[PDB]
């Protein structure tokens, strides 16, 4: 995942 918070 490129970023956090993607769940």
């Amino acid at each position, epitope marked *: *995942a*490129g*970023x*956090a*918070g*993607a*769940g």
Partner: antibody, heavy 116, light 113 residues
Framework: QSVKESGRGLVQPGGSLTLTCTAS????????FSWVRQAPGKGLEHIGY???????FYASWAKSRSTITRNTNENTVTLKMTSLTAADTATYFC???????????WGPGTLVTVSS | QVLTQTPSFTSAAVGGTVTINCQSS????????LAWYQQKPGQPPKRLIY???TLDSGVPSRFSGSGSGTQFTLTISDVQCDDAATYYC?????????????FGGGTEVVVKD
């Protein structure tokens, strides 16, 4: 692949600011976008992040009085802040920061003056 | 203060060398999401480096990023007048259901002539 901020640039303490970030040349749900601000002669400070999937996350100082929202129909992301003081006078940017990925996109910024 | 940037102010003559350091209170996302921005007064910031060490488009080779974990460095060799600016490191952090960014306090770079 650009964004542009718009909104009322003169607001009063106790009021609210509403800033709209409109994307051009792409759809604004392809990426996560942050709101960032810079008070006069101060550093950049992160307000909040709307993930590509559509969840909003806020810095501690901004959590209670900020709301970041997305309208994929209009191709916009929106910042609302309430309980304004003169401390909120600043340039506001919407930006895909690109800390770790090839795409970074910043708007020109919009200057908000808070005064009564 | 997630990201501690030092020094606050540095200075060099044309052709000199500048180093800016960024210390993070915790690891950045994927140990990778750290970027360096250049801002001139009255203009939007410009991204110089992303993923710790990858140069962006329009960035001269005299800019170099390095580091890992909690320590990151930006160096400018053969410093030029166009490099006079304020520099910020920016880190991405979070988990699977939390996400944020932190900027360093910033470094003013003054080029002397």
């Amino acid at each position: 692949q650009s964004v542009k901020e718009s909104g009322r640039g003169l607001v009063q303490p106790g009021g609210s600011l509403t800033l709209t970030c409109t994307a051009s040349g792409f759809s604004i749900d392809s990426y996560g976008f942050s709101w960032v601000r810079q008070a006069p002669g101060k550093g950049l400070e992160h307000i909040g992040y709307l993930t590509a999937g559509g969840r909003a996350f806020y810095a501690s100082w901004a959590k209670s009085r900020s709301t970041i929202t997305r309208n994929t129909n209009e191709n916009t992301v929106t910042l609302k802040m309430t309980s304004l003081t003169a401390a909120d006078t600043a340039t506001y940017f919407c930006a895909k920061l690109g800390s770790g990925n090839p795409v970074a996109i910043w708007g020109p910024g919009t200057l908000v003056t808070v005064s009564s | 203060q997630v990201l501690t940037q030092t020094p606050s102010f540095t200075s060099a003559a044309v052709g000199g060398t500048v180093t800016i350091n960024c210390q993070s209170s915790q690891s950045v996302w994927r140990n990778k999401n750290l970027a360096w921005y250049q801002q001139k007064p009255g203009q939007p910031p410009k991204r110089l480096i992303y993923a710790i060490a990858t140069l962006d488009s329009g960035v001269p080779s005299r800019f170099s990023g390095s580091g890992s974990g909690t320590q990151f460095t930006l160096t400018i060799s053969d410093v030029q007048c166009d490099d006079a600016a304020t520099y910020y490191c920016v880190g991405h952090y979070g988990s699977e259901n939390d996400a944020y960014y932190a900027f360093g306090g910033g470094t003013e770079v003054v080029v002397k002539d």
